[PDB]
C-alpha cells in the first residue's frame, strides 16, 4: 500500500458513484438557486495535500509551526476576498476559515452577542435562512434560535417584498442587538440603507448575509451591501462558483474629539477559532482563493450579467405562459414561481420535475397555509448559466417545466393524497413512459452544454 | 471560459503555493500527532463534483430532490463507518455530516443538552481539547463553555494519568449530564469502564471523543470505547488518514418495560437543521474512501506499526536525556517532558521547525508558564504512513536531539524569547548550523514514499 | 427587660416618627392611586405574635410542627380569598404567601416559565408595571426582564387605550409563553376576552395582574378578570384596603375523550416556596384575611361604588377646569391627567402639590419624550374615599389641585431648569408663604375626615 | 364603617385564632432555632400606619413624593443597623428593604452576578439554606439554583465541620464568582478568614449569611463576619428578635491607582427596581426598633445567655443518652444525633409536637434517608427571651427525654410512619400518656414571661 493509487483502482464502488453523480449533473437542468458548478482549477486545490496541514490560529499568530505556506495561502485568500469585493484593506477585514455558511453566521453571533441576546431575520418561509434565527410555532429549529433569541420579520404579502415598515415598528419593541439583511429565497434587491437606518435607530449591528448574491455583488452587477453593513457573511459555493466554504467580512478602523474604533476583528476571529471551530480546512481556503481570483476577472462580470439576463428571461417566459411570480419578477439570479393559480402545489411539481431531470425546490408563497404542499417553486439561473446557457436556452427550460407541470396536473386529477401522487408517477405505466419521454428530451438538451470541472468526476 | 482549465494554467500563483506546500510535507518530518497524509483516492473524491450538490437533510428525508446519488454516497459512508468499527447496525448509528471534529462535539451537546447544562472534560493544559468545555481563569475560550456549563477534570500531577478518583468526587458535586472521555495530548489509555461507572452513578452521558485514536480503535489494536460509551465522536483525519470531517456515532435501539434509545433523532436534528446547512458531500465521499481503507488488513498492519514507532520513539527518547509524561506511551503519540533538559517546550518547537521538524509545544504537569510550556507533543501516524519503521523513528529522535542541543546553545547568548528566535535568523554562526542540519533533515525525509498526488 | 414595654416608652425616637407619619396621612390629600388606609382590625393582626411563627410549607404539608393554628389562619385566608372573588373552590386555588405584588408575579413566571422564556406586558411608561418585564433602551430594569425575555405592548396614542390589534400582531411574531393583562396607570377597563383570544392563538398563559382594581373586582362593580384569566395575581394593600401582601389565584380541575387537567397549583405553590421565598409572614396573611372578610361585606361594595363615583367626579371636575385626561375619562379608581395643554409638566406639578400636602405621582402621557419631566399626573380615589370622601369632596380636591397648578405655572415663568423650580419653591419668600397658605387650607380640609386605623400610629 | 373598629369586635373568628396562636406560643417550649418572640414595641410598629405608605425608591431618590417621614425612618433604620454591628458608615452600607431573608440573598446574586453565573454554598442536608443554591439530584429546588449555577460544598461526614479543604479544592475547578459562608443548621463557628482566603484565590465574592447568628454577632459575643466578608445578608428575626424582614450589608468606599467599591449601587438597584416593589415601611420601622434593642447592654446579656443555655442544653443532652453533631455547640442551637438512640429524627419531632415541644427534624452526616432524618434541630433564642436560664434549659432536655422515650414505645407496636402517628391519636394508652406529659409541659412553660402583647 502506497496511498498513491487511483480512486478508480482502489475503490471502484465509490468511483462509479462519483461518475453517477457527474452524469446526473451533466444530464440534468439544475435549477437549485443555491447550486453551481465549481471549476476544475478550484477542485484541484480542494482535493490537495492542504488537507494534511493543521494550522489552528491565524497567519502570523499560529499555535504550531510548519504553516509557512498555508499562511501565504490564507493571506492570499484574504487579499483576493477584499479585492473581489472592492474593499479597502484599511476599512475591511475578512475571516476565511468558516467551514460553511451556517458556521459563518453562528460565528458572528457568538462574536458580537451574549447567549440569549436578540436576533432579527427574515422568516424562513418568507425567504430567510435557518441561521437567521428560525423558530416554528412549536420547536426551536436553528441553533441560532436556541443560543440566541430571535424574532422574524415578514414579507408584505401584497408586494412580496420585505416589509421594512413592519420591521422598523417591531424592532423598536423587540430591541434586537443584530439584524440580518440576507435571504435564501428572495427575487428582489434588499434596501440595505433602510436596514441600516433601522439598525442605527435601535442600536443594532447590521449583518448582511449575501450568500446567494455574492457573485453578483463581486461583479458589481447589483448594489453592494458593504456600503451599509457592519458585517458581511457569505457562502463561497453559490453565485461565487467556488468550493463549499464561508467568509466573514468585518469593518476595521474608525467607527467629542474621541476616535471611536471598530472592535469586530478580534471578536470575530476569536469566535471562529478557538471558540467554534478547530483546524481550518486549508484545501477549502485555497479552492475559495482560486474562485475569488476568478471573480475579479472580466469573464466573471460577463457571467454574472448573463445570470441576471437568464433569470429575467426565465421570469418573462413563465409570465408569458400563465404563471405568476412572487414580487412579480426578479432583479437577481432566481425566480419565485407561484403555482397556486395553476392548480399544482410546489411539492407535486418538484417531484414530477425531478423525475424528468429538472432539479428545483418547492417554495412557500405568501399566504401558504401548508408546508407539506407549498404553492411555489424556487428556480435559479447560476448553475446552468455556468454551462453557457443563454436567454433562449432558459426559455427552453421554461418549456420543459411547463410540460412537467401539465403532467403533474393530469396526475392530481387521477390521485388523492400526496403519496398517491408520488407513487402514481412510478407505478402507472402511461405516465411512467410519458415521464420517460420528457426526461429523455430534457437530458439530451442539457448534455450538449459544456460543464465546469473534471470530465469524469 | 469553460471551468475545465487546469489549476497550473489558470492560477499559477496558487499552483506554486500548492507545490510549495507539497514540497514542505515531502521534505519535512511531520510529528504533529493530529496530522496525517491523505490517500490519493480520498483526495480525488474530496476535489470532485460532489462539491456542487446541495443535499440538505438525510437519505430518504431530504428537503429538495436530485439527491439520488448522494443518498447512496451517504448511506455507503454510514455502512463503512459502522463496518470500520465493528458496530452492529441495530445497536449503533452514525452521522457522517459534521464538518469537522469541533462541529461534531457541539452537535452532541446541542442534541442532548439544554443551554447551560453541565459538561465535564479533561482540562486543555491537562491534555483535553477545546471542545471539551475549556474556559481559562480569565475567559470562556471554547463555545462549549459559553453555551454550556463546563468544569474540567485534571490529571494526577505526577502520575501523568487522569485522576479518576478526583473526577468521581467532583462529578457528584457538579452533577454533569455529560462527560467527555477523550484527549488531544494524552499518551496512555482511557478507562472507559471507569468513566461509564462515574457516568452511570451521576446519571450522565458518556461521550468518547476518539478523534486522535480513531484509527487505532478501528484496527482493533487498542480497546474500543464503543463498549461503554453512549455516544462516540471523532475526526476522520488524524489516525483515520482521511479528509477533514467529523463523525458522530450514537447508540440505537432498546436501552418492567422496554425503554428505547432516543439519541438518533436528536443527534441528526442537531447536525441539521440546528447547527449545519448543506453537507459537504465531497468530504463525506472522501471519508467513505478512507473508512473502506480502515477495514483492510493493510490498515491494521499500519495502525500496529504506528504503535511500535511511538513505543520506539518513546524508548529512544527515554535514552539520550529525556523524561516523558506518564512514563510510557500506549498509543500514537509521546508526551516528552523537556524541563529536565534546561529547554522549554516553546523554544524547542521553534528550533525544530527551522530544521524541518514540525511539532507542538505542550504543557506538562507542573508547568508554571504557558508562554513557555515544558514539553512537546510528537506523533507517529504521519511518518508511519510514509513507511517509516522503528529504525527510521529512532533516527528522528536524535535528529530532534541535535535540534534540542542546538537550541540550548542560543539561549546561552539571548534572554527573552523574542531575542531567542531573532538570533536564529541573524547570527551567521547558527543560521549555518541550522542549514547544515536542515539539509540532512530534508535529505533523509525526501527518500520515503508519500501518499497523495505527486505535485499537489 | 420584658419585651412587653410600649413603643412610646421603649423607643420615643421611633414612636414620634410613627406619629409624624400618622399626622402626615391625616392632614394630607392622599391621591396616590396605589395607596389606601388599612383598617385597625387588620393592623392588629399585622402587628401580632404571628410574626414569631415559622411555618415553611403549606397547610397539611408543613416541614415543622406547631403550625396547628397558622394552618387554620392560612386556610381561612384562602377560603376568604376565593369567597371575596366569587370563585368556586373546585375551579380555583389561591396562594396567600407572596410577600408583595412583585414577589407574586415573579413566582408565576418561575412556576410556569423556564429562564429566558418570553413575556409580554404593557410597557411601563404606557401604564404597565415593572414586574411585567420592563426594559429600557439601555438597561434591564426589572428582574422579570433579566430572568425572562420581555417584549412590551403599547397604548394606541390616539385613544389612550391598549392597542389590542398591535398586541395581536406582535404576539404572533414574538410568540410569548405568557402575557400580562394588568396595569399600574390605566384609567379604562381591560378587554380580558380579547387578551384571552390572543393568548389562545399564540398558545400563551394569560395572567391578570388586578392589583390596582382588585377591590373593585371583589365588589363586582367592574368586570372580573377571573372569567378569562388562567392566573390572577394581586396586591392586597391597594383597592383591597389590606396589609401589604400578594396573592396568586390559579385554576384547578379540567382545562379525544381525554380529560385535560390544570397543572398550575403544584407549580405555583412550589415556586413561592421553596423556590423563591422562605417562611411565610403569617401576620401579613392574617391581616389580609381580615381585609378579605371586609371585602365580602355590603359595606365594601358601597365603598367601591363610591371610589368609582369619586374618580368620575374628579375626572369631570378636571375636564370642566380645562384639563385633558388620557383616554378621555375613567372607568375605575384613577385618573390620568394630561398637563401638557396647560404648560406644566407632571414633575413640577407633583412637587408643588406635595408642598401643599397633596400627594400624587408624575405620569407619562402618550407622546412624552422626557422622563425627567413627564406631562401628566396619576390621581387616585381609593385612599380619600376610605376617609368617607364623597363626590363634592373630590371636586374640592380638584380645586386645591388647580391652585397648585397655577402656583407652579407662576414659578416656571420665573425659573429655568427643574432644579431652579424646586429650590424656588423653598427659597422665594413670596411663593413660600403663598404655598404655606394653600397647604394650610388643604390640611384643615383633610383633617376633618375620619381616618381608618389607630388614632395615634 | 370607619376602619377603627377593634379586631375582636369586627372579626371574632380571626381574633380567636390570634388568641389561640398566642396561647400556643405561651404554653409551649419553642425550640426552633430560627424562631423568637418579638417585642411589643416592634410589633406596635409592625402593625402601624406605615403599611399605608408607598415609598418606592430610596431616601432622597424616591419616584413620587410624600416620603418626608419614611425617609427618616429608613435612614434611622440604616444608622441603627450599622450601629448595631459596629460598622463605620464610610466602609459599610446597608439596604433595609428586603422583604425577608430569601429575597435578601436573591437580590445579592442579581446585583453582583449575571444569570447562570456560579455560586457555592453549604448543601441543604449539610446545614445550608435553600437560598444558598440548593438543587437535589432530581430537581432544582431553590430559584438560586435556577437563575444561577450552584455547586454545594459539604461537611466532613464524621468531623461535623465544614470540609474547608474540599471546598478549596472544588472552588478552583468550579470557579464560582460568589461563595456563601452561612448556615441554617450548623452548631459550630465558621472560619471567615479561611473562606475569604478561598474566595480571594478563586477571585470570588464572599457573602456571609448570618441570619441565624446575627444577634450573637451584634452583641460582639461571637466573631463578626464583617471582618472578612464583602457582603453580609441577614434576617431581622431569629436571634435579632425582630419583625420578619431582611438586610443586606455591603462594603463601601475605597477597595497604582484607587479602586473604589462598587457594591452599593448594584445592591440597591437589585432590591428596587429589579426585584421588589414598594418597601414594607412598617417592617422597616419594626426592624429599627429591634436594631436599637440590639445596641443595649441588655441584648449582650441576652445573647450571652442564649450561648450558655445552648451549651447547657448540649451538656445535658450529651448525658442521658444523646450524641450531638460536631461534638460541641458554639452558638445558639444544638445538632442532636438521634440515630444512637434507635429513634429517627422525624418521629421524634412529631412525638415532641404532641407534647408541646416544637422542633424540626434534621439530617445528620451519614443519614441514609430523608423521610426519616437522624437528628433534631433545637434552638435556645426563643425560650431565652422568656427569661429561661441554664437550670430551666436542663429541664427541657429531660422533658424531651420523656418524649423521645415515649416515642420509642409506640414504634414498638407500629411499622411505617403513618401507623406511628396514627397510634398516637387512637390508642387510649398513649393518648393519655401524651396528655399526662402535655399538662406538665404547658404548666412549666406558662410560668415564664412572654415578649409582645398579652392577648395577641
Ligand atoms: N425560505 C427558505 N428556503 C430554503 C431552501 C433551502 N433552504 C435551506 C434550509 C432547508 C431546510 C428548510 C427547513 C428545515 C426544517 C423546517 C421546519 O420547519 N421543520 C419542522 C416542521 C416540519 C414539518 O412538521 O413538516 C420540524 O420538523 O421540526 S423548514 C431554505 C431556507 O433556509 N429558507
Ligand atoms: N490537549 C490539546 N492540545 C492542543 C494543541 C493544539 N490544540 C488546539 C487548540 C489551540 C489553542 C487554543 C487556545 C487555548 C487557550 C487559549 C488562551 O489562553 N487564549 C487567550 C486569549 C487572548 C490571548 O492571545 O492571550 C486567553 O484566554 O488568555 S487559546 C490543542 C488542544 O485543543 N488540546
Ligand atoms: N406606568 C407606571 N407607573 C408607576 C407608578 C409607580 N410604579 C411602580 C414602580 C415605580 C418605578 C418606576 C421606574 C423605575 C425605574 C425606571 C427607569 O426607567 N430607570 C432607568 C432610567 C431612569 C433615568 O435615566 O431618569 C434607570 O435609572 O436605569 S421607571 C409605576 C409603574 O411600574 N408603571
Ligand atoms: N439547614 C436547613 N435546615 C432547614 C430546616 C427548614 N429549612 C427550610 C427549608 C424547608 C425545606 C425545603 C426543601 C428542601 C428539599 C426539598 C425536596 O426535596 N423537595 C422534593 C419536591 C417534591 C416532594 O415533596 O417529594 C424533591 O425535589 O424531591 S423541599 C431549612 C433549610 O433551608 N436549611
Ligand atoms: C443566505 C444563506 N445563508 C447561509 C446559508 C448556509 O450555507 P451552508 O448551507 O453552506 O451552511 C445558506 C444556504 N442556503 C441553502 C439554499 O438556499 O438552498 C443561505 O441561503
Ligand atoms: C480529541 C479532539 N476532538 C476534536 C477536535 C476538533 O477537530 P477539528 O480540528 O477538525 O475541528 C480535535 C482537534 N485536535 C487538534 C490537535 O490535536 O492538534 C481533537 O484532538
Ligand atoms: C399592577 C401592579 N402589580 C404589581 C405591583 C407590585 O406590588 P408591590 O409594590 O407590593 O410589590 C404594583 C405596584 N404598583 C405601584 C404603583 O402603582 O404605585 C402594581 O401596580
Ligand atoms: C441562613 C438563612 N438565610 C436565609 C433564610 C431565609 O429567611 P426567610 O425565611 O425570612 O426568607 C433563612 C431561613 N431559615 C429557616 C430556618 O432556619 O428555620 C436562613 O436560615
PDB file of C-alpha atoms in Angstrom, chain B residues 27 65 114 149 205 236 248 288 312 329 346 385 437:
ATOM      1  CA  UNK B  27      10.886  17.309   2.768  1.00  0.00           C
ATOM      2  CA  UNK B  65     -34.798  16.462  -4.939  1.00  0.00           C
ATOM      3  CA  UNK B 114     -30.182  22.363  27.114  1.00  0.00           C
ATOM      4  CA  UNK B 149     -21.503  24.993  31.776  1.00  0.00           C
ATOM      5  CA  UNK B 205     -23.971  10.712  29.265  1.00  0.00           C
ATOM      6  CA  UNK B 236     -11.909  11.499  10.037  1.00  0.00           C
ATOM      7  CA  UNK B 248     -20.992  11.125  15.499  1.00  0.00           C
ATOM      8  CA  UNK B 288     -16.065   6.828   2.877  1.00  0.00           C
ATOM      9  CA  UNK B 312      10.245   3.039  19.693  1.00  0.00           C
ATOM     10  CA  UNK B 329       3.122   5.671  25.731  1.00  0.00           C
ATOM     11  CA  UNK B 346       8.164  26.542  23.283  1.00  0.00           C
ATOM     12  CA  UNK B 385       2.151   6.483   6.507  1.00  0.00           C
ATOM     13  CA  UNK B 437      21.165  20.148   9.803  1.00  0.00           C
TER      14      UNK B 437
END
